[PDB]
Design an enzyme around this catalytic site. Structure first.
Site, PDB file in Angstrom:
ATOM      1  N   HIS A   1     -83.590  -4.915 -37.294  1.00 35.98           N
ATOM      2  CA  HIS A   1     -82.345  -4.798 -37.919  1.00 35.98           C
ATOM      3  C   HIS A   1     -81.370  -5.857 -37.706  1.00 35.98           C
ATOM      4  CE1 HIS A   1     -79.991  -2.426 -34.703  1.00 35.98           C
ATOM      5  NE2 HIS A   1     -79.093  -3.038 -35.451  1.00 35.98           N
TER       6      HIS A   1
ATOM      7  N   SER B   1     -77.187  -4.324 -30.208  1.00 36.15           N
ATOM      8  CA  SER B   1     -78.460  -4.278 -30.930  1.00 36.15           C
ATOM      9  C   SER B   1     -79.451  -5.390 -30.252  1.00 36.15           C
ATOM     10  CB  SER B   1     -78.521  -3.935 -32.066  1.00 36.15           C
ATOM     11  OG  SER B   1     -78.082  -2.726 -32.560  1.00 36.15           O
ATOM     12  N   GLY B   2     -80.452  -5.160 -30.132  1.00 41.01           N
ATOM     13  CA  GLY B   2     -81.512  -5.952 -29.670  1.00 41.01           C
ATOM     14  C   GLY B   2     -81.489  -6.576 -28.212  1.00 41.01           C
TER      15      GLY B   2
ATOM     16  N   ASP C   1     -88.085  -0.669 -34.707  1.00 48.62           N
ATOM     17  CA  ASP C   1     -86.933  -1.469 -34.731  1.00 48.62           C
ATOM     18  C   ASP C   1     -87.160  -2.488 -33.765  1.00 48.62           C
ATOM     19  OD1 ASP C   1     -84.461  -2.843 -35.522  1.00 48.62           O
ATOM     20  OD2 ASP C   1     -83.208  -1.154 -34.623  1.00 48.62           O
TER      21      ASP C   1
END
Ligand SMILES: *[C@@H]1O[C@H](CO[C@@H]2O[C@@H](C)[C@@H](O)[C@@H](O)[C@@H]2O)[C@@H](O)[C@H](O)[C@H]1NC(C)=O
Length: 218
Positions: free
Chosen positions: A41, A173-174, A88
């Site tokens: 994402h 995120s990530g 994801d």
């Protein structure tokens, strides 16, 4: 990261900052000299040609000669579902190979299919928001978290801090979740806002993707 602490400089030499026009927007993990892994994402709706992959960073507000910067040559996806935030995960092939050194090192991954149960103690990290109003971190943050299965799907690894409000947040995120030295999660989503003290943080479950990862990093 809400309620964490500054990492020691270069403690986590696999930790990557993904940037656009010089601003951090997501984390990543160095998994080979010429590949990073992040959350799908993070790049789904971004100009991939503009992404800068920054290795060797600690304090994003300072000039750091320890840094190595790459562009994204190719992306590899594995069934990302943006509606349900399933799968994801993405692999970004770099336009060159990192110079491996004390500050830039490849992460170690678990075995395919390894599932963590309640109570495993991990470290989350990132340059994401520090809490309400305080913005993106300058210095890499880390945070002790515990794996939980309550209020988690089997398709995620989730974590919770007990006894206080702390957790990952936007811009994290990530970023990797490190458990017993291995990268078992990629930060994916929160519920109830950051650091609710109720809903666990959800990570993409790296161990479910290892054979696929291995096939790509060749
Ligand atoms: C790989 O790319 C490095 C960074 O390129 C810079 O960032 C990307 C996102 C574009 O904005 C590009 O125009 C910028 O120059 C380079 O510094 C490096 O030399 C490249 N390495 C190889 C081996 O091609």
């Amino acid at each position: 990261i809400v309620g964490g602490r500054r990492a020691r400089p270069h403690a986590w030499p696999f930790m990557v900052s993904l940037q656009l026009r010089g601003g951090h927007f997501c984390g990543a993990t160095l998994i080979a000299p010429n590949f990073v892994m992040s959350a799908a994402h993070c790049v789904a709706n971004v100009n991939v040609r503009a992404v800068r992959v920054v290795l060797g960073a600690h304090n994003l507000s300072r000039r750091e000669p320890t840094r190595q910067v790459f562009a994204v040559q190719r992306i590899f996806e594995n069934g990302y579902d943006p509606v349900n935030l399933l799968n994801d995960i993405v692999i970004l092939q770099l336009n060159g190979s990192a110079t491996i050194n004390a500050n830039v090192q490849v992460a170690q991954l678990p075995a395919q299919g390894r599932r963590l149960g309640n109570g495993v103690q991990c470290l989350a990290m990132g340059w994401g928001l520090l809490g309400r109003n305080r913005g993106i971190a300058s210095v890499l943050q880390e945070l002790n978290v515990t794996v939980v299965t309550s209020l988690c799907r089997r398709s995620n690894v989730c974590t919770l801090v007990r006894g206080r409000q702390a957790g990952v947040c936007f811009g994290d995120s990530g970023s990797p979740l490190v458990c017993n030295g291995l990268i078992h999660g990629i930060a994916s989503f929160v519920r109830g806002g950051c650091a609710s003290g109720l809903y666990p943080d959800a990570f993409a479950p790296v161990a479910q993707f290892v054979n696929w990862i291995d096939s790509i990093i060749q």
